[PDB]
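Lab notebook, bench 4. We co-purified these components, and the gel suggests they stay together. Before we commit to crystallization screens, I want a quick structural picture of the whole thing.
Request: model the full complex, all chains together.
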Amino acid sequence: MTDPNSPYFEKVLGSLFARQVEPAKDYAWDMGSTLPTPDDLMRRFIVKDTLITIFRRHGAVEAPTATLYPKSSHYGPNAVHLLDRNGTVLQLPFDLVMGHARSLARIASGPVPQRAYSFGNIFRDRQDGGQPDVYGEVDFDIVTTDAMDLAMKEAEVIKVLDEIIAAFPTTSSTPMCFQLGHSDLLQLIFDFCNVEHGARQAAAEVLSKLNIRNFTWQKVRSELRSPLVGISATSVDELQRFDWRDTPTKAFTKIRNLFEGTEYYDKVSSTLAHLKEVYEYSKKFKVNTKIYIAPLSSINEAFFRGGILFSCLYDRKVMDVFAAGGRYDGLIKAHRPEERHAVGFSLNWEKQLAKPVGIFSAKRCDVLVASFDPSILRSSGIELLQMLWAHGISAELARDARSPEDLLTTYRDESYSWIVIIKQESQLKIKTMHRKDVPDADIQAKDLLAWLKAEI
Amino acid sequence: NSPYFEKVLGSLFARQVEPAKDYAWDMGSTLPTPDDLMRRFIVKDTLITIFRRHGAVEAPTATLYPKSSHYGPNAVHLLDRNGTVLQLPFDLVMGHARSLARIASGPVPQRAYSFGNIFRDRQDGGQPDVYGEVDFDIVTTDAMDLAMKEAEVIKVLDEIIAAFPTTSSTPMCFQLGHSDLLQLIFDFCNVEHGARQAAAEVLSKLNIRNFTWQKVRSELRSPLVGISATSVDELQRFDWRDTPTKAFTKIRNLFEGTEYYDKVSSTLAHLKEVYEYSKKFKVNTKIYIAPLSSINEAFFRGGILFSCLYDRKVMDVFAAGGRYDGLIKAHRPRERHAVGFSLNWEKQLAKPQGIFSAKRCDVLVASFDPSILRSSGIELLQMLWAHGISAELARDARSPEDLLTTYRDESYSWIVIIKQESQLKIKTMHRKDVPDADIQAKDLLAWLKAEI
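Here is the predicted assembly.
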């Protein structure tokens, strides 16, 4: 109710942007700040590198992401908000689709890659004056200027996620499933159950948790019955007639049977044909993960108004989300002040794929170059290194050591494929570390490249 | 921080966006073309390959932190909910030095690279300008072999130079200096301390893009800096570069008989050891000593400074860096040592049969029957993907001339056309002397491998 043009607003802005940071807040910013261990970092590199290999098979390129933009009303206080000097409230990305949709709505007309992936940061606010929590998210998006084969693009996105499942150990040998829904279906269900328009976004948000982390229909009913949402007891009864999932042919029949005599039938039928087409394309793409139709699917439905929704789940007795997405044509249109259509998923790849709970056998560094003579180390050692780098072999110089025992103790936390020790008179002792049945070999320095190549 | 300042702050963060401001934010914005994005992938992929040879891993980069007094109004400044003025990265070294001073995570990787964004503030309400910077850093926990680590950073740059077409056939050079050398020159030339940062900023342009000594002297004598004419004359005695042995001799001669001689000589001995390690690393690009080197010297206080330059008649900067141990200490609250470089890799390397012959997509799967395209086409697609072959599906087309006209702005290695009875017509597009071939669909995989 405050006057937005109140002159106290400019007074405090200029006053605060003139203040230098107070020391208590400067120290509080990153007091208990920790960095991932270098073993975490190598795991992150293997995951990212595997992910890009999958994306590139599809002809995708990396696209840049928006870092900063006017706040969206679609987020609560755990989004990071910041003020620029002329008073606009800005946010850091909370997900990556918001900035991508805004960019697709606002950028000048021009060509955009059809298939693109992006690695960006998303942020969570903490209320202790510390820096925001930061997380790596990866998106894969298919953007077209024509509305042709919309269901086929959607099935390719599901296919990419199926390829990711197959590529990683945390997902390759565990039950996963896809659950497909559709914003038009959900809104027609809301029409069917006489859910008041002012309550639907709140209802969608509670439903997005249904059967995730043991958030059963009883919990859902509570929150929908709370006066913060305010759904009538009869409407919740009707919505519960849709609390199920099933394989597609069955689920399409159930749904048509639920809407049989209603005015909603033709629109639902259009929507089920689209899901059917997606399901059929997924069979052509050879998706191995089980597909379910879940009519109350609603994760981020405000972003996906008018389009398919999908989530990929850990399909165990208690389920959790692996990735989620949908067609966000409607989010693009809602941000226009050049038709563009987009479907994609978002994935927290570090949490789901990189944290430990094969591809991870790759070493940070294959060759350690060492010598017990400090002066040989800093001459011949350097000359071997640049040779190995010139032939694509990963290699690093050791610190000084007095004996093999002392060297391996110093490097007890590291893991190499080979440890090369430079002796006097151009002779190399090679300790093979990636096995244990292989004895140490002395070779001539001139043969190091041949010996390493022939070893593999 | 009276209850006054809070109440207005909370109301500021509740205020709705002005429509004119919301439009201005990204009115007129662009993305790079899809061709630029593929070139960026190739460059980034080659860079990472170089870095991984050294055992390096990618380290995360700080996105947001309390504002540094060193930047002016072209750095992006933002207020958080507690009224602290924060900034977006203006460069990557500031964030890395803060982290190394403020975390206690014990072991950090010794060799690391990072790709981050840096930002420049705009005046017309538009979003900040964004640029992609890449850094390579070597971080150590003792003062042993600092010069060897510095020479390795220089060798990584030499490997980048040899790897890319825009740098491997152009005259390039390294110019080496040292913050202690620069500050001893300032003492020798009687340059007042309040003027040294502005002086070092002017000197960082010396002979870059025709910024000759005449232009430097004008700025040094201006109110931007305010150095005496005597002091500028003495500084000109250092306006040269030479190969290292000859450079060290000239510098010792200029300082002979001064109180600074000992510290100069000690500093020259560090630079000689970097030069000697560079020869052992087999650095191919010419190395010069340039006593007035000063790019970002405030970040490299107490450490070596170096730039990598295009060495044509008109010179320009490729990458720059230095040892920023001193920036780390300056951020300790109320040891770690680091050296590295920074480079705008998109501008220098991605801005345009070579690394850039790699195809965005090797196979286009087409058909002139829409139901075959959407049945057999999908099946061939997933089969190609499952064997690591990059492939995409064409839109509908009525003839090969229509298909080729539609895809004029793309470049594939092969166009596979599906027709009746599991017959494929394969057009070879990466050569020109190769005629079309019809094969059985069950042989597409073998046929492709028989060509590469």
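Chain A touches chain B through 104 residues (CB under 8 Å). Worth comparing against the SEC data before the next meeting. Chain A has two domains: 38-67+95-359, 365-454.
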